[PDB]
From Swiss-Prot, chain A:
Protein name: Methylcrotonoyl-CoA carboxylase subunit alpha, mitochondrial
N6-biotinyllysine: residues bearing it: K626
GO cellular component: cytosol; methylcrotonoyl-CoA carboxylase complex; mitochondrial matrix; mitochondrion
Stated consequence of mutating A241V: In MCC1D; mild form
Source organism (scientific name): Homo sapiens
N6-acetyllysine: modified positions: K189, K446, K533
An annotated GO BP: L-leucine catabolic process
Residue positions where N6-succinyllysine is found in the record: K533
Curated annotation (Swiss-Prot), chain B:
UniProt disease link: 3-methylcrotonoyl-CoA carboxylase 1 deficiency: An autosomal recessive disorder of leucine catabolism. The phenotype is variable, ranging from neonatal onset with severe neurological involvement to asymptomatic adults. There is a characteristic organic aciduria with massive excretion of 3-hydroxyisovaleric acid and 3-methylcrotonylglycine, usually in combination with a severe secondary carnitine deficiency.
PTM remark: Acetylated.
Subcellular localization(s) per the UniProt record: Mitochondrion matrix
Subunit-level organization: Probably a dodecamer composed of six biotin-containing alpha subunits (MCCC1) and six beta (MCCC2) subunits. Interacts (via the biotin carboxylation domain) with SIRT4.
Function: Biotin-attachment subunit of the 3-methylcrotonyl-CoA carboxylase, an enzyme that catalyzes the conversion of 3-methylcrotonyl-CoA to 3-methylglutaconyl-CoA, a critical step for leucine and isovaleric acid catabolism.
Protein name (Swiss-Prot/TrEMBL): Methylcrotonoyl-CoA carboxylase subunit alpha, mitochondrial
Residues that, per the record, bind ATP: K115
Length: 660, 126
């Protein structure tokens, strides 16, 4: 493969292209009308447009992607994730056209569409699948036999239907009288079916995903499994790479079982075999994914491998470069996914511009993958994800500290995000202890979405100082353009003659206003009295790259925070949190009844009493010496009286309507 | 240890903080009146003043360093070298207050003050 077409966008498109450039492979991408100025367009060597912004017209199209591959002379297509990555007809179309599909062959994709087909293929290979029964023959007497065969714990759910009603839970043997009561009291009035299926457990399950990688020569290796249990709304929010909470024997057993599963279905490529476990390491297979997934960079940190390179090599016809006995396991890695969403309403996605974007410091152990640049917008046509932060450290506790340390350096201004949720999710006593299961977030939901807290007086001093220094900066850049350079008045010192200068400013902390009296001292320091308490406030601005930082010293306590001032809101990003302080807007900048323009007769009235108009509304039309004048509303409210009915003569500067 | 207070100055203060940042640990330092513009003040995430320039009023003080550790919510104190690094009473004070002393326990420090005591303890071990 000397040139690959990547039929995808954003983070995954850039992740693959960076590897391609590293290897020497040319990259082509597609961008619709929607991504004309996205990140992957400039990273690619060449890219083609397709059509309208919705994905149905651009990335899900089978013919358009092939047409791009043919005209660019691409040798292989990488579908990435989410669009054509599971499209078996597309893989077959590539084969017939002559283009290498980077992924499993159609024969391995099609048989995985039906869950019962892959269950039987793998079960026949010695894979520990979730067994149970899928038959209708599980009536009361049969249910007793089935429960004994699989074990006394049972969860009973309908063959068809759901909603949370009519379900029966068995936690001991001597509970079939309760099962019979429930089967008659409610279960058969909502399901309207006697047939119900059984499973074993619902108590704190975990999702554990073990990777399989195979080639066209009959080889397969496994890479160490992840813990993917932490989710809300069935969307993964964070992920732990080495799957803590298991022993080395479990890791070996999952490796062998997943390879037997991958061979059973003759899988080639980078895939994932998903197991479900209980508290006693009874792993059961549920599903297998047949694509190179976005989750993989969190595992690469602990295995030391490069799966994108591996996938391209076997697609060219090569063998697996590294055997199952050469795969190591060092340290722990975590991913935190940052979405454009507002958690205050139970996470609805939001779309808008990003005014400021800053990433944590680069480090070989801190891998930063973004698909959004500063100045870019979040769309509504595609995934609202902004970035993924992946960290590595020597052990689990060190990685959790690094994850939170670096996550607080990730600054987004312009829209609402889930960063505060991620911080409260990781920094939770139960999560750090390791109490992780699929219901962690709904179990502790009230402890993760916390209300806004009031700012400390020291934080208000920092906001006031940042504002004063920003005003100085404006003064300094005016002076740099002046003829009268080096002159006094340019130094924002507040030096009054024989007296001191005190500036009274008000900052709005949430809902409440706070008055801060700032005295300008002769030595450049400030004395800021907030309510009664005086703070000795010193500081200045400095730049590091494209970011401005505010350096403070308040009563001998030094600190440093990033200072971003956007329209009215002062953002202070520190290592202890993020505080937003608003500058109040005066009335005369936020204010933006009526009279007769000349002495004319009124053609049409519009409104009467009891109506309501909003500003910029037609109230009246009047003709004055053959010139049609439509009156409008600068004011607002409800009309109490209309003084001139239609056809009467109004005079100059005579009141027309009234607001009470 | 998510936050460490380094009760020292200069080269040793910067050497430890660079590791802390590498690991993800927040760093607090102290600077007296003398080191207000020294290297470790800007490298630290937060630092507190104490008092007059001589070390007796700033870095050798037992109470001032603990007071800084409590108000910054530090979990551990690193004495570095030369000030409180051999102060057994300080290690005992940290234990009683609840702050992790990064170093040997007081029981290992006190018995090493007298040269004849450590000579016999080690000689008896071969």
């Amino acid at each position: 493969i000397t040139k690959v077409l990547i039929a995808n966008r954003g983070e995954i498109a850039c992740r693959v292209m960076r590897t391609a450039k590293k290897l020497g492979v040319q990259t082509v991408a597609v961008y619709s009308e929607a991504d004309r100025n996205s990140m992957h367009v400039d990273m690619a060597d060449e890219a083609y447009s397709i059509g309208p912004a919705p994905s149905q017209q651009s990335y899900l199209s089978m013919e358009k992607i092939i047409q791009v591959a043919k005209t660019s002379a691409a040798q292989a297509i990488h579908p990435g994730c989410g669009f054509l990555s599971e499209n078996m007809e597309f893989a077959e179309l590539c084969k017939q056209e002559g283009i290498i599909f980077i992924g499993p062959p159609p024969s391995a994709i099609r048989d995985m569409g039906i869950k019962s087909t892959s269950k039987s293929i793998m079960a026949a290979a010695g894979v520990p699948v979730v067994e149970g029964y899928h038959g209708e023959d599980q009536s009361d007497q049969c249910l007793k036999e089935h429960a004994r065969r699989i074990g006394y714990p049972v969860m009973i759910k309908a063959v068809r239907g759901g909603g949370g009603k009519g379900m029966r839970i068995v936690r001991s043997e001597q509970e079939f009288q309760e099962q019979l009561e429930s089967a008659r009291r409610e279960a058969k009035k909502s399901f309207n079916d006697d047939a119900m299926l059984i499973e074993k457990f619902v108590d704190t399950p975990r999702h554990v995903e073990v990777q399989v990688f195979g080639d066209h020569h009959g080889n397969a290796v496994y890479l160490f499994e992840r813990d993917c249990s932490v989710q809300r709304r069935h969307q993964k929010i964070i992920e732990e790479a080495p799957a803590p909470g298991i022993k080395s024997e479990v890791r070996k057993k999952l490796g062998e079982a997943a390879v037997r599963a991958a061979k059973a279905v003759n899988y080639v490529g980078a895939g994932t075999v998903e197991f479900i476990m209980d508290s006693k390491h009874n792993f059961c297979f549920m599903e297998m994914n047949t694509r190179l997934q976005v989750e993989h960079p969190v595992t690469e940190m602990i295995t030391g491998t490069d799966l994108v390179e591996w996938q391209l090599r076997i697609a060219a016809g090569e063998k697996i470069p590294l055997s199952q006995e050469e795969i190591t396991l060092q340290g722990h890695a975590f991913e935190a996914r940052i979405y454009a969403e507002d958690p205050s309403n139970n996470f609805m996605p939001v779309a808008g511009p990003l005014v400021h974007l800053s990433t944590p410091r680069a480090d070989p152990s801190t891998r930063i993958e973004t698909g959004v640049r500063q100045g870019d917008e979040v769309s509504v046509h595609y995934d609202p994800m902004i970035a993924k932060l992946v960290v590595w450290a020597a052990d689990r506790q060190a990685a959790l500290t690094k994850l939170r340390y670096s996550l607080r350096q990730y600054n987004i201004v312009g829209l609402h995000t889930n960063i505060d949720f991620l911080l409260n999710l990781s920094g939770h006593p139960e999560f750090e202890a390791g109490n992780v299961h699929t219901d962690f977030i709904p179990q502790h939901h009230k402890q993760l979405l916390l209300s806004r807290k009031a700012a400390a007086k020291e934080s208000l001093c920092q906001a006031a100082l940042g504002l004063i220094l920003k005003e100085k900066a404006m003064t300094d850049t005016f002076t740099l353009q002046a003829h009268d350079q080096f002159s006094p008045f340019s130094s924002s010192s507040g030096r009054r003659l024989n007296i001191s200068y005190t500036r009274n400013m008000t900052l709005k902390d949430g809902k409440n206003n706070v008055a801060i009296a700032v005295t300008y001292n002769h030595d450049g320091s400030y004395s800021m009295q907030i309510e009664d308490k005086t703070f000795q406030v010193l500081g200045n601005l400095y730049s590091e790259g494209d970011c401005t930082y505010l350096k403070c010293s308040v009563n001998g306590v030094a600190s440093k925070a990033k200072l971003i001032i956007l329209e009215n809101t002062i953002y202070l990003f520190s290592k202890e949190g993020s505080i937003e302080i608003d500058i109040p807007v005066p009335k005369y900048l936020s204010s933006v009844g009526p009279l007769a323009p000349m002495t004319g007769t009124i053609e049409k009235v519009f409104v009467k009493a009891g109506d309501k108009v909003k500003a910029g509304d037609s109230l009246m039309v009047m003709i004055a010496m053959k010139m049609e004048h439509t009156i409008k509303s600068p004011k607002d409210g409800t009309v109490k009286k209309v003084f001139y009915r239609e056809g009467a003569q109004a005079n100059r500067h005579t009141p027309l309507v009234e607001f009470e």
